[PDB]
Design a protein around this ligand. Structure first.
Ligand SMILES: [K+]
Ligand SMILES: [Mg+2]
Length: 248
């Protein structure tokens, strides 16, 4: 509903700094150091869709897909009540509690389908304070997480200016990338052209327990369309559930 007061945003910033010390930005799973990701069998995807008329009602979805076939083997959607509006840089405080609850519900119902990695709609370390929603989910669940964003977060001097759009033009095939370098010189993420018949890139960053190069290549391998299939299937389910709720 209402934008949070400065007292709340300060506490949220403090919480992000405390948790950021737990981010692991290298590979820690045997399949991640395999040239073909042999051993990777389950890739997760999450989405939260907010109802057009209601600032309280939302639908959170978790899917698990087989790898490499990308078939849905687990799905869960839930209507939830929002506690916070969208504020850029504080996305996790609007939705990460629902995602954690979705992972806990999977652990109770189908523990053998726990994903080995989760694609999250939104940034990881490409973030105002280096701790976006993909890092936040990763630290709370200890699952490997990848941040996949559909627009460029303009932090650390990153801009969607004419030079950025030129670089996008040079991305000519599915799988082409260019690095996102902050003013500090740090590599924050990668722009990725995710398939041959899309021109607007994805922006991929490390969430937790994965390296950037592995994060980018896996994201590419999950793309049948622009949006990686685990996120895409969670989107589809969240919106269908909202539709059926309003009657349709
Ligand atoms: K989402
Ligand atoms: Mg989505």
């Amino acid at each position: 509903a209402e934008r949070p007061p400065e007292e709340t945003l300060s506490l949220w910033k403090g919480e992000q700094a405390r948790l950021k010390a737990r981010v692991v930005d290298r590979d820690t799973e045997a399949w991640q150091r395999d040239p073909s990701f042999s051993g990777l069998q389950k890739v997760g995807g999450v989405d939260v869709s907010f109802v057009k008329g209601d600032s309280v009602r939302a639908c959170a979805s978790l899917v698990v897909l087989s790898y490499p076939e990308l078939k849905v083997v687990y799905e869960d959607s839930r209507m939830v009540g929002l506690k916070a509006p969208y504020v850029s840089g504080f996305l996790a405080f609007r939705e990460v509690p629902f995602l954690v609850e979705l992972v806990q519900r999977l652990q109770e119902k189908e523990p053998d389908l726990m994903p080995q990695v989760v694609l999250v709609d939104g940034n990881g370390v490409l973030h105002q304070r280096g701790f976006g929603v993909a890092c936040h989910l990763g630290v709370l669940t200890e699952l490997p997480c990848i941040g996949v964003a559909k627009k460029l977060l303009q932090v650390d001097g990153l801009e969607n200016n004419a030079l950025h759009k030129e670089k996008i033009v040079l991305l000519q095939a599915g799988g082409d990338t260019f690095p996102l370098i902050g003013s500090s010189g740090t590599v924050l993420g990668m722009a990725l052209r995710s398939h041959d018949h899309s021109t607007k890139p994805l922006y991929v960053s490390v969430g937790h327990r994965i390296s950037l190069e592995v994060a980018v290549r896996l994201t590419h391998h999950c793309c049948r369309f622009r949006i990686p299939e685990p996120i895409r299937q969670a989107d589809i389910r969240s919106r269908e559930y909202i539709r059926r709720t309003l009657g349709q």
